[PDB]
Write a protein that binds this DNA or RNA. Structure first.
Ligand SMILES: [Ca+2]
Ligand SMILES: [Ca+2]
Lengths: 153, 153
DNA sequence: TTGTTCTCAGGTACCTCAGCCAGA
DNA sequence: TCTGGCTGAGGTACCTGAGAACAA
């Protein structure tokens, strides 16, 4: 497990709290046991003009990708393991997104069991609802309620 | 002069590089000796729902004010002295806005003499152009050329 | 079936200026 | 004459979702 220095993590938390995003999503998918796929994402958005600053993040964190769309780029990290390691080290220094990070860490750790029973999956889905509630959510569609009404059949 | 905790400056530097703004402006002023007044401002913008976060800055930096402009609030610091003290301590940790901080610091230290010669004032005004060049400038009107055009007989 | 990569975009929440006015 | 406390806004640059496809 990669260990990050504290000066790196302090600055990064400030940058994440400002321009970053901690995202949990439930994605409709018929081929999945409970008809949905859980998706966790850490994101940093920045004008493509400064894509390099995001590229440095890849190098410095040791993983992730940079995507472009129009005039804006994103560093993204969604691989569960690395995500867990990074977030665990980052969360003590977060101020605006501390709870989201903690909610994500709790979803990750409970993932195995959530895959065994619908009630447990629905439960993890409510933690996802909470992340979205803390975020400035504006176009959310699939929620724990969606999942509940589908399993009720 | 207040000396700030280092953990705090690092976090803050990340937040400033994210949601903050280091700005220099030349304001046409009828009374001012050279027909213009210099304004240096440090801003942190955040949705009014998170005004408390800006309020804590007033407490932690020990100076400045918080204003409401719609659904959005801003922490603002523009008094020269306190601004100089704050920025000189922040600037080593800044990444995206280190240049602007340093140009502002240079302007501040040159303020006494810029009031003397008009060439010196136009000089300071070019350092203002550079801060604006480094920013995502979109609606800037008064520049050093503008001032140049005014100072004539 | 599952984890993940990659792209698009809705709706702001920022950013970075503009300018006034009272007191000093 | 100068400075600092106020306010309003143009034009994005973000945030936080959506969804398709591809391994494994
Ligand atoms: Ca922000
Ligand atoms: Ca930003």
């Amino acid at each position: 497990n990669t260990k990050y220095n504290e000066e790196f993590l302090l600055y990064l938390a400030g940058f994440v709290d400002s321009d970053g995003s901690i995202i949990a999503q439930i994605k409709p998918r018929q081929s999945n046991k409970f008809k949905h796929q859980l998706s966790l994402t850490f994101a940093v958005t920045q004008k493509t003009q400064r894509r390099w600053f995001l590229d440095k993040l890849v190098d410095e964190i040791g993983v992730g990708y940079v995507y472009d769309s129009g005039s804006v780029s994103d560093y993204r990290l969604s691989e569960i393991k690395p995500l867990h390691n990074f977030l665990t080290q980052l969360q003590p220094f977060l101020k605006l997104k501390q709870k989201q990070a903690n909610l994500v860490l709790k979803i990750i750790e409970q993932l195995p069991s959530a895959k065994e029973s619908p009630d447990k999956f629905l439960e993890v889905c409510t933690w996802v609802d909470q992340i979205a509630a803390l975020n400035d959510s504006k176009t959310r569609k699939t929620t724990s309620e969606t999942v509940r009404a589908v399993l009720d059949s």
